Amino acid sequence: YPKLQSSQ
Amino acid sequence: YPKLQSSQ
Amino acid sequence: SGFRKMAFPSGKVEGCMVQVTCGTTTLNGLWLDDVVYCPRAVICTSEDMLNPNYEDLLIRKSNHNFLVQAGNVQLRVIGHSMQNCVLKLKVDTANPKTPKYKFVRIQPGQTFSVLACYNGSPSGVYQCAMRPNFTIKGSFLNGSCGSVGFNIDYDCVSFCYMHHMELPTGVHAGTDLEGNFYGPFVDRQTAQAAGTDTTITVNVLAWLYAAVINGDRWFLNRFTTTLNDFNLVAMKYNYEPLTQDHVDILGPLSAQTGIAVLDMCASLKELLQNGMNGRTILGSALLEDEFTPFDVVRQCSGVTFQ
Amino acid sequence: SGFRKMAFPSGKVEGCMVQVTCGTTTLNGLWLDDVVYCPRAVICTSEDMLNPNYEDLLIRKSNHNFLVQAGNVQLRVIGHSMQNCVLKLKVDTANPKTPKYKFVRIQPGQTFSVLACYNGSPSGVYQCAMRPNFTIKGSFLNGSCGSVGFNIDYDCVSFCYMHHMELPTGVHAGTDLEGNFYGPFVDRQTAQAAGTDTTITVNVLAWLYAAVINGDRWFLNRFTTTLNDFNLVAMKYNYEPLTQDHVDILGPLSAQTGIAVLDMCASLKELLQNGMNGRTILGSALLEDEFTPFDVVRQCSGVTFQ
């Protein structure tokens, strides 16, 4: 699946 | 011959 | 001499990079005058990532839910709005480092520099092309969301890309600075895939001209082709159709080298049909397509090394 | 994901670039605190280029023969001295944009970013390696003399290269920032030629590890080799000897991927002996050697994509 590349 | 790459 | 995959000097953009946090989610923003631009995915929560309603998520937020850090200083958010897939956070301080700038939506095949960033801090700069399938083959990790792509014309920064996401093939998808995606993609983690890609023919031709300017002619031949006949070979090798507009754009490089555009097309056709036979062009064993005709003219000398 | 030939963000260096003119000769200088550093070839005249005596040429100059332009402003030269092949022009104004910085002389095989400049104005940024024969394969035109190469560690700019000249093969030669040439070259236009070059083995191995981190394993094999036996293949293909120090340096990448260093050596040996058979690694049809082990770790994720 596509990944929104923000960070946690 | 090698060229010193200043400008005129 | 020499020919490198050259990026624009990134300093004018470095001065614009900030960090935006909403909740437990952080990414990069772009601070121009008193507005911070960033991907709206910052208001997502890690479980509502499949199908978030952003209008719904955003109306539940206040200005003070957005924490914007410009290196040392925190910036106060005094207004917020959504435009397509980007958020515009109005802050109470105009960025004193704002360059002359424009927002531009580019065409596939155009190139740009990417300033990769994490937590508002630039890490590296590299040159990209917008692929015909509207992905870019970038280098991006988690935290890079909000990194921007740009060109510089004189001292005007034309921003053309904001990074959002990585597709399952490892290529990258993002928006213009108005938040409109390039390609059919959406900012949600549902099943999406890049369409089949093609090679940027006009760029390959520009790079062959670069090679000739740099004193290398081994791939040339005595033949020519018609545009129609070239395109019939192009289609067979998954190359974009070459248009009369492309031929026109390659005009200056043709005139500087004395090689007619359709003559260079005959060279490319032969390279496509025979391969390189263990030879290299400008240090590559593949036909390179991430240099535009403008890129070649910008980097190369006006003399051709006869 | 992705893996690009990434440069350092160039802004800290952009703020340091100036123009230096002596007579009819102009080139770039590097303005740090109240000193401008530039190639001593600026005091050459177009006919005394074969064998200039620079000590003789310089003693015939006064401070006011040097015109230094920092964009808009002219800077007053208040002192000058020669150190090896560079001039140090003391100016009456400390550069307010001076970063934290060091001067470093690098080893062959190390990489750095080049900020190409003309008339004190940056044009582009790209990544280089110092070749084993102490040339760099840059992209440089007349006027680029004085452009610098650098690394950035945290926010400290380590300057390691100042550009002087292009050799007849189209590759480039220059000095550290103390004016000492890399390689046997001298700053005069007498016959000089680069020695035979070799491929940077430890870097090729680092880049194979990058490929594995990025999810690609097609080139691996079930074999291993001894260091001695690997080096006997290396010599045959014009690769540098791999040392135990190199093996040690590749330690972290070995541990992150689970591939023993000598196991990756067995993969490289097979690639050298068989070629790629029409396959690519990280988008290249050649074995790439301009990424150090540090470069790979910096750009890649700490996760390997299992």
Author numbering:
A (entry chain C), B (entry chain C): 2 to 9
C (entry chain A), D (entry chain A): 1 to 306
Give the article text.
Further, we solved the structures of SARS-CoV-2 Mpro mutant (H41A) in complex with six cleavage substrates from replicase polyproteins. Substrate selectivity is revealed using structures of the H41A mutant in complex with six individual native cleavage substrates. We demonstrate that the subpockets (S1, S1′, S2, and S4) which are endowed with an exceptional selectivity are important for selective and potent binding. Additionally, other subsites such as S3 and S2′ to S4′, which have less specificity for substrate recognition, may also be used to enhance inhibitor binding and to specifically target Mpro.
